[PDB]
Each structure stands twice: as structure tokens, then as C-alpha cells.
UniProtKB/Swiss-Prot annotation, chains A, B:
Cysteines engaged in disulfide bonds, as pairs: none
The gene coding this protein: EIF2B1
Domain of life: Eukaryota
Organism lineage string: Eukaryota, Metazoa, Chordata, Craniata, Vertebrata
InterPro entries per record: eIF2B_alpha/beta/delta, elF-2B_alpha_N, IF-2B-related, IF_2B-like_C, NagB/RpiA_transferase-like
Full protein name: Translation initiation factor eIF2B subunit alpha
Organism: Homo sapiens (Human)
From Swiss-Prot, chain C:
Domain of life of the source: Eukaryota
Cellular component terms (Gene Ontology): cytoplasm; cytosol; eukaryotic translation initiation factor 2B complex
Keywords: Cytoplasm, Disease variant, Initiation factor, Leukodystrophy, Protein biosynthesis
Gene it is expressed from: EIF2B2
Protein name in UniProt: Translation initiation factor eIF2B subunit beta
Entry similarity comment: Belongs to the eIF-2B alpha/beta/delta subunits family.
Keyword Protein biosynthesis assigned: yes
Chief localization: cytoplasm
Reported disease: Leukoencephalopathy with vanishing white matter 2: An autosomal recessive brain disease characterized by neurological features including progressive cerebellar ataxia, spasticity, and cognitive deficits. Brain imaging shows abnormal white matter that vanishes over time and is replaced by cerebrospinal fluid. Disease severity ranges from fatal infantile forms to adult forms without neurological deterioration. The disease is progressive with, in most individuals, additional episodes of rapid deterioration following febrile infections or minor head trauma.
Compartments where located: Cytoplasm, Cytosol
Gene3D superfamilies noted in UniProt: Translation initiation factor eif-2b, domain 2
Quaternary structure and interacting proteins, as annotated: Component of the translation initiation factor 2B (eIF2B) complex which is a heterodecamer of two sets of five different subunits: alpha, beta, gamma, delta and epsilon. Subunits alpha, beta and delta comprise a regulatory subcomplex and subunits epsilon and gamma comprise a catalytic subcomplex. Within the complex, the hexameric regulatory complex resides at the center, with the two heterodimeric catalytic subcomplexes bound on opposite sides.
Pfam family, one: IF-2B
Effect of residue 180 to G: In VWM2; with and without ovarian failure
Amino acid sequence: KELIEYFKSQMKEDPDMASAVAAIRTLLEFLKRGLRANLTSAIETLCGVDSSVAVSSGGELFLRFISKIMIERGELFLRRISLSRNKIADLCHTFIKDGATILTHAYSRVVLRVLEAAVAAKKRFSVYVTESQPDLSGKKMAKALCHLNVPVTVVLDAAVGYIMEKADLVIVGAEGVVENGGIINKIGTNQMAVCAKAQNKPFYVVAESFKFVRLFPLNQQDVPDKFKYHPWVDYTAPSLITLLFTDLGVLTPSAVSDELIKLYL
Amino acid sequence: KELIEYFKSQMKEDPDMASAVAAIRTLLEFLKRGLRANLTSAIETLCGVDSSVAVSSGGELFLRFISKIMIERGELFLRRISLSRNKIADLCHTFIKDGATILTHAYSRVVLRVLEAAVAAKKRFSVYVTESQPDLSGKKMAKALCHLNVPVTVVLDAAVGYIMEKADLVIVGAEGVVENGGIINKIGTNQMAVCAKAQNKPFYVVAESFKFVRLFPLNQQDVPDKFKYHPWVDYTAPSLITLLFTDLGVLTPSAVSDELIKLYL
Amino acid sequence: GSELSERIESFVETLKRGGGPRSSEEMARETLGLLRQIITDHRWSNAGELMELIRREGRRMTAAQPSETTVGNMVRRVLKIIREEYGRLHGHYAQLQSNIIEAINELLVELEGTMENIAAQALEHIHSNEVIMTIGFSRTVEAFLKEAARKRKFHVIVAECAPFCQGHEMAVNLSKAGIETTVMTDAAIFAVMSRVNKVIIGTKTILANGALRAVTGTHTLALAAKHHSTPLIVCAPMFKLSPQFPNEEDSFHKFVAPEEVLPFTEGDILEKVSVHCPVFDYVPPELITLFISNIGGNAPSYIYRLMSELYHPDDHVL
């Protein structure tokens, strides 16, 4: 299996790199070798390794975007995906006020990008990071934010209702966005959004454009079982979400459905 | 310090025994040796070891109940406290329906008593226990309930919003009850009560009568700092609580204030 | 040249000092007149030079009164119109200028009949024996009510916006038409809200989230209406719709002198007190049910589409 080997070579050489970006680069590398479309279809039928929503979402969006201009199409598509994060930070970091109390979920490079863009604009704020422990990743987020020279406090996992009254805004990076405006993320997003709604705090979602999946879960069981695995995945209602921060602009949760209707899956 | 030694001898000889019961027994043992009231006042000024709300609450209620009949007063008071738990189980276990999905917080002997009284009345039900990990005590609750031969599932701490839609009632034992009907408990009670209120599930509190403390916190900071210690203690609003189960009967949260007005602190 | 810069300076100082003119529609008509006068008496080779000129002339009007977003987003609409004309002529000196002339004339034709179309579709939202509650003073909402009362009999609670009692004029102008109006203060809003069936308010600026700023105290009315579950009707034109995000830029509220709240004759206690008078407030889009424009009723979950159809994302900084 050379596709999984190239995926591991593109994902393990840079630990600050996303997985769906490396998957679309693997699809483009198969498109470099019609026979190229057949090889890309073979490896995308053979890429059933990662259980993330963003990987399969980017694979489906590249499978639609591919359908001799396919290589240059994937080239500027990966150019837009690579230049997405700077537009994410530049459109999102303007909402953080001075002296605010930041609430943050587990480790993701997107919220780290928007916090380093926020401290790049001369802003002072304290960040409360939930530990989020099926595995210690919120500690890794607090360690990577302590190197950023910002005041961070490692918060216990069952204290998001304890610290909600003092955290004025709740900014959480999501790993998958369904059509209505809800998000698929790590399991502690639902309780944080419900405690933010009960305390009237604005719940912000910071995710890119390739995480737009065409699914519609009603309950916590209606998310697919291949993305669940002690679950790793919850679901947040779109009524619990104030705004989204994509590269197309700062969007209300009803705009993702507009983009997916104009895109047609 | 012989008072702390007698407290450790009464609390460590039986691991299924509460702490406030042993504290009131230590106060009665000092009352066995006026000079007995002076020794009891000295050891209750010297019993600043346990940070639980129930210990200081039972100490204050015994200090009021003491004020030659003091020894027999403490004797039948400890008789009522010892016979409380059977009345707790007999008044509380009649609400659990057959085939229900039980949601349970961390380890306490009171919820274990009501679940063994529920399986004693020929009832079949599944129990979801939140792991509640500043320390692994929900695993100890699941181990002590697995010995009870009931189907228990160890639930991740950040999944109380994930499993709330399938758990039809939420029964949680509290360690301290303030006057308005709110409770002081372990830190993951607030998020569970908020997720139960957002999902309209009945949140039941199972606590005794000696846990009636005369405090009134408005926020998560207004609880005293000597009971907090990464906090171990949250606060649940009385609007988030359906019923309480005391030895005086199954009470609404507005009845604790009536009992504390009739008792006058 | 001289008359151009003179009228530009006069408009800038008029926006710096106070509210001139009083009507926002009259200020929009003067904004289109200023933009057509600045394009008819100037010289350019490329359309982007005119774009930079309109940006440089609009930055001064934005910094004149930051709470008056009508001139700024009208400048931004004219920038998108000129961009669309350059796009349809790109896929050019006099033809583009005549296209700009006929497009701004068509924009005045569309802008003169905004309140007329709102009063035309006013009938499908008011039934007989209805309790209406409003705040402040706005010509759109009172035109809505005086057209809806031509065939229906109902009641309006004219709640005053009271940093300065301007809603008394709305109550008198409705009671001259016979709407059976009732006058109260800001302190009786939730006290009377248990008998209010619908909330019909105006606004000053529709934001990009669907949020809106309006006359102050209407966030309280929106909270009481969300508590009592009544739908909110926002009768608002399509030139108060702006792409300025709420928490993105500063100077949201407009502060005036504290004389209207606490007078100068109060005494020695004025030294040790801090009296702030916001004449506007923030209303989130989840507290809003329906927007009423001249093209039809729209949702707060639909303001972004009007933002895409009326504004360009490279003009949001201006």
C-alpha cells in the first residue's frame, strides 16, 4: 500500500499539518501518474484509515471538484486550502476584546492560529482550556499556548459549567460541519455549548470550508458509527452556535446550508 | 490529638461509613467524659480536617441540638442518623420504572443503597455511571454496582450531553444541600443538571437531613473557599432540581428552606 | 472643484456636528446626489482610480459620524454597482459614465418607493383587534400602522424611547389618524408585555449577522418578547443593511451629552458621578423573528444573502 505510505510521509513529516490536506495531496500525487483518475479512485477506495470527518469530507469535495485540467484544478484547490488558514485568522481574530476570558476545547491548529493572530494584534486575554481527557490533548494545547506567552490555565474536564459564568465568550474549533450549521467535534463540545446557552454566552465555531459534510444527525446516535470510534464524537445543535468563521467570510450557521445547496454535495 | 485519632478509628474501620456520622460520634465520645461540653467545644474547634460540607453541617446541627440530657440527645440523634438511610431507600426507590436508563454521578453509599433497594424490589434497569475523574471514583462506583449484578457501563466524563437523550431520569446523590433547594456536590453535577434541563429530564437529588447547610451561593465563586479545595466543588441551581429524598419524606426543593426556617439554623 | 469641495466639506461638518438631515431617506437621497455630483465633475482614466477616489472620500464621511452607517454602506453599494458595470464592460470613458448615471438614477427610483412598497405589503401582517407595541420614532413603522389601519381596527402601544422623549411625536401623529394609541414609559415594558401580541419596531442599522442597532431600550423589548414568545417585526429599508460585524470594530453606540439624563442643575453630586447616555443598543439576531423590506419579508437567517447580493467582500473595510 503506497498510498497509505505517502499519506504517512506527508502527515508525519509536519506534526502541525492537517490530515485531509495530506489526503488531497495523496489524491493529487496519484493524479500525477484515464489511468490517473482510475488510480485516484483506487486510492480513495483504499484510504479507509482515518476516522475523521474532515478527511472524508475533503475526499468527497475533491471527488466532486475533479469532475487534462484535473491536475491544475487540484493544484489551485490545494492552494486555496493552504491559504485558507490565514484568511481564517484574519477574519476571526477581530472579535476578541481586551481583558476577555477565553474558553477553549482540545488541541487544534486553527484555534492556535487565531490566538497567535490575536496576540499579534497587541491584545491581552486569559484562556481557560478544558483538559478533554479520553487522552491528554488539552494539556498539549495549554503547553503549546504557554510557549505562545499567553496566560493559560489547565481546567478540569467537569468544570465547564463551573467556569462558564466568568468566560464571556466561548471559541471552539470544530473538525466537521454538517449542513444545517451544527458541528461534529470532540465529545465535550455538546455540554460546553449547552452550558454556554444556559449562561447566554456566544458560542463561536472556527472551522474551514472543506469540513462541510452533507449529513444531518438529529440525535447523538444519528452520527455515523464509523466516525464515532467510550465515544470520541458528539453533536452540537445549530441553535447552540452563534457564528462560524470560514474563508468565505464570517458566516451565520444558516450560510453553510446555502453554500452546500449552491455546491450540490 | 486524640479526637482526630478517634475520628480515624471510627472512619477507617468501616469504609462504607460516612464522615459526619463519625464526627458526631466523636463529639458524643467527648460528651461521655460542665467539662464534657467544654471538651466537645474544644474538639469541634479542633476538627478542622475534612473539607466536606456534610461534616461541618452535622457539626453545626449537633451544636444546636446539644443546646444531663445532652448525652441521650446525641444518642437518639445518632440513632436517627443511623436509621436515616433505610428510610431514604424506602422513600426513594419507588420511582424507578422497569427498563429505565439510570444516570449516576460518582461514588456515594446513598445511591448504592437506593439501587440495591431497587433491585431488591425485582426491577430491571441499566445504569450509566459518569467516570468523574479528578480521581477514578466512578470506576469504583461501577465496580461496586457490578458486584450488585446490575448492568453498568463506564461512561466518559465528557459524554453526559451525549447520553442525556437516552437516560430518561437522572438520579444523583449530593453531599451538601443549601437552604433554597440547591445542592453542593462534586464538580460534574452542574453540567449534568444543565444538560438534563435542556433535555427536560427529571433531576433527582438523594441526600439525608444532616446535609442541610445554611449557606446561599449565587455563583460558582460564592461557595466558600475552604470547601472548594482544579476545583472539587460546583453548585447546582434549585430550578435545575426536580425532587429531594430525605428521611422526612420526598420533598420539593422549597421544603428544605421550610425545614431550615422551622429549625432556625 | 471649488463648489464640489465646498459641498463635500459642508456635508462632512453636517455629519460631524449633528443629525443633518433628520430623515434617513433624505440623507440617502443627498448621498446619491453627492456621489453623482462627484462623478459628473471629475476626471479619471481607469475605473479603479474612481474606486480609490470614492473610498478616500468615503473614509472621511465614515470618520465624521461612525454611528451613521447609511452614507458608508450607500457608498459601498455604489462601489459595487460601478464594479459590476466595469465587470460587464470588461468581459470606456463616456459609456461607463452614462451607465453609472442611469444606474444611480435607477437607484433613486428604487429608493423613492421603499416605504410605499412596505406600506403596500403592510396589509398581510396586521389583523383586527390587535395589540401592537413600538419603540422610538420612525417614519416607516408609523406609515406601516397608518396604512394597516385603513381597513383594520387595532391598538398600538407607543412606548417612548426616553433619553429624550421622541416617541411622543409618534403617539401624536398616530392619534391624529386614530389608531387608539396608549403612551407609557420604558419602565412599563415587561409590565405591559403580557398583553402585547406583536412587536413592530424600526432600526438604525442592520448588521451582517442579522443583528440590528435601533433606538435604545429595544434590546429589553426583544428580551421581553422572547420571554413572552411574541414575533418581532422589523420594518426596515434596504439601505440600513451594512456589512459591519458587531464585535469587529469599535464605536458601536453613539454617546451624547448626559444633560438629557441628569441635568446641569443637579448640584455638587455631579462631580462624583459618571452619567453615560447611549442613544442606541445592540440586539442579537436570535431575538428577531422577521425583517420587512420593500422586496418582501426576510428572515434573520437570510440577511447574509442580501449582503452577498448588495455588497462585495473586498469593500467591508472601506
